[PDB]
C-alpha cells in the first residue's frame, strides 16, 4: 500500500457540520460556521481577530494589502520558503528582499536582517517552516528599532508556540493555510490573525469585494473575492475542535522516526528543535549527508518506487525564474538546504509499520 | 409570512450525495475527481473544448486576463454598467479599463459605441451578459476582429444562454462564469473559464496552480496564483449542472408568471426587453421603473423589504463610484439612467406562483 507524504484525518464533526450546511442550504460565503470558526481560531491563538479566507495565499495577499504594502515598498522574505510568501509581495506591486535562513531550523536568520533594511523597507515576513517558529524576539527587536511591521506566514505551524505565545499572535498579523496537507484542513482555506482593530477592519472590507456594508453595490475601494465558504469553515471548526488530538498524532509519528533513526547513521541529519516553544512538526524534515553518492532527487524517485511519497525542501526563490533577479551572494544556507532537504511522510494516519517502512526504504536508498 | 429572497440555491439534485462522497473518500481539497468531471461536463454543456474550474468568478476573470497577457499599459473595454469584478479584474492586471455605455433595453454593451473607444493600447473588449441575456455578439466580434482584439465574455449571469446557435462561454476567445450562491448554477463560491484555445487553456491551468511545473515539484517557471476550486465545490457544481435544464425551466416558469401578471402594473414598470438572438436565461427578471412615478428606486426597494420582499438595484455604473470615478466620460448616460431606475425582482427556482402574486401585489402598493 502507498504511503502519502500527508493527508487529513477527518475524525471529528466534519461530516455532520458539512451535512448541516448542505441541509440548511447555507453553502456559500454566508453562514454561522465562518464567524464561529474565526472566533474559535482567534481564541485558539490568543489574538483578538481572525479573518477567514479562501486559501493561505490570498490570506497573505490580503494581509499585505491591508497593511499598505504597495509599489516601491520592500518586504523582507526568506528565499527558503513556499513561493506564495514572495508571490504575495509581488501581487502588491512590492519588492521582496530575500534573506538567508538558519542551517538547523531552516528559518529566517535574524542576524542577517539588519544589513537588509533600506529606506524602502516596510515589513518583514518570518515564515515558520515545518512547524517551528522563527526566533521571534530578535526579529521583533530589529523591527521595532526600524518601525517595520512583521507579518508571520504561519501556514505550516498552527499550534506552535514561542515563549508562551501561539503562532499567529507574535507579529502585527500572521497568515495560516488550511490546504489538505496541513495540520488542520478545510480542503482549501486560510485565515489572518491580528490584534489590531484597524488592520482587521480593512481586511474584512477588502475580503468582501470592498463593498460598503450599508450600500448594495456601493464600493468605496477595489476589493477582492477572498471569502471562505460556510462549508470550509464547518470542516475547519470541526478540525480545530480536535486540534490537540491532531498535534498528539504528529508527536506520535515523530517519536517513531526519532527512536528508529540510528539505523540511518550520519546519512541524514535530523530536524533540530529550537528550545523556544512547541515545534508542531507539520513535516519531519532531514538533511541528507554530504557524503552520499546519490542525490536528494534520486532519493525521492527511489522512495517512490518503494511506494513512499516524499517532498524536497523548497527550491529557494532566487534559484527559480520568477525570482532569479533577486539573487545575492548571501543566500548560501538556503541553497544548501534546498539541495539536501527532504520532507518525510508526516500525518495523523501513519502507523509505526509505516514509519518502519520509511526507515527501511531510506536505509536501502541512501548510498 | 416568510420572506421572499431575491435568489437562492435550489439544491434539489445529487449535491448532498456527491459532497458526502468527497467527505467519505477524504478528498476535500483541490485534489479529487469531481474537478475534472465538472470541467468536462461544463465544457460539453457550453460546446467548447476546455473548462478551467476556479475558486470564484472574480478570480476566473483575473486568471483569464493574466493568461491572455493583459497587463500594465493595456486597455480593456468594459461596460460601466456591470458588477465591479468586471473592472476590478483588469485593475488587478495593472491594466486600464475603458468604459463603454450599454443599450437601454438590454442593459448590454452598446456595440455601436465600441469602435470609437479603440486606441493603440486596447487589447481586449469584455462584453458582460447581464441578467442572463447575451450581448449582441456579432457586431462586437466584427469590430474586435477588425482591430485584432481579444474578446472575453464575462458570462457570470448567463449560464445556459444561447446566441445565434452558440452557448454563452463559446463566443469570445474565452469566457468566465460565477457559481456564487445566487447564480443559476452554484458551488456556493466558485467559477469557470471556458475556451477552445489549447494554448490559453494550458496557460490558465498553469497559473491557476500556483504557476508550478507539473513535472517538477516546487519548481515555478512563473508567478501564479491559488485559484483552484475544491472537490466539494466541484461536486455541488456537477450535481447542479446535472439538472441545468430543470433549473432553467423553473426560472422560465417564474418569468412566465411575471410576464403574465405584470399587466396589473401598467406603465408603472418597464418589463425587461428580450432580443430574439437566442435564449435569455433570466438570472434576474429586471424592470426599469416608470418615469412617471413620484417615488424613487431605492424607496421602492425599502418598501418591498418592509413588505417582506428582497430585491436589488441595477448596478451603480463604475464611473459613479470612488474607485472608478476617474474613468468617467460624458457618454455613459444610458448606464447612468439604468443605475437610477433599474430593479431586479426575486428570480430563482424556488419561487412559487403565489410568491409572484405577492411580489406583484407589493409593487402595486409601492409604485406611487
Ligand atoms: C507546502 C505546499 O504544499 C502543497 O504542494 P504539494 O506538496 O505539491 O501538494 P499535493 O497536492 O501534492 O498534496 C500533498 C499531499 O497531501 C495530499 N492531499 C491533499 N489534499 C488532500 C485531501 O483533501 N485528501 C487527502 N486524503 N489527501 C490530500 C496529497 O495527496 C499529497 O499526498 C501546496 O499546495 C501547498 C503548500 N504551499
Ligand atoms: C451580483 C452579485 O451578487 C452578489 O452580491 P449580493 O446581491 O449582495 O449577494 P448576497 O450575499 O446578498 O446574496 C444574494 C442572495 O442569494 C442568497 N444566497 C447566497 N448564498 C446562498 C446560499 O449558500 N444558500 C442560500 N439559501 N442562499 C444564498 C442570499 O441570501 C441573497 O438573498 C455578489 O456576491 C456576486 C454577484 N456578482
Curated annotation (Swiss-Prot), chain B:
Keyword list, A-Z: Aminotransferase, Lipopolysaccharide biosynthesis, Pyridoxal phosphate, Transferase
E.C. designation(s): 2.6.1.102
Outcome (variant: residue 183 to A): Loss of activity
Cofactor: pyridoxal 5'-phosphate
Modified residues (N6-(pyridoxal phosphate)lysine): 183
BP GO annotations: O antigen biosynthetic process
Pathway annotation from the record: Bacterial outer membrane biogenesis; LPS O-antigen biosynthesis
Molecular functions per Gene Ontology: GDP-4-dehydro-6-deoxy-D-mannose-4-aminotransferase activity; pyridoxal phosphate binding
Reported consequences of knocking out the gene: Mutant produces altered S-LPS.
Superkingdom of this protein's organism: Bacteria
Enzyme superclass (EC): transferase
Stated role: Catalyzes the synthesis of GDP-perosamine from GDP-4-keto-6-deoxy-D-mannose and L-glutamate. Can use only L-glutamate as amino donor. In vitro, can also use GDP-4-keto-3,6-dideoxymannose to produce GDP-3-deoxyperosamine. Involved in the formation of S-LPS, which is required for attachment of the protein S-layer to the outer membrane surface.
Sequence similarity: Belongs to the DegT/DnrJ/EryC1 family.
Subunit structure: Homodimer.
Name of this chain's protein: GDP-perosamine synthase
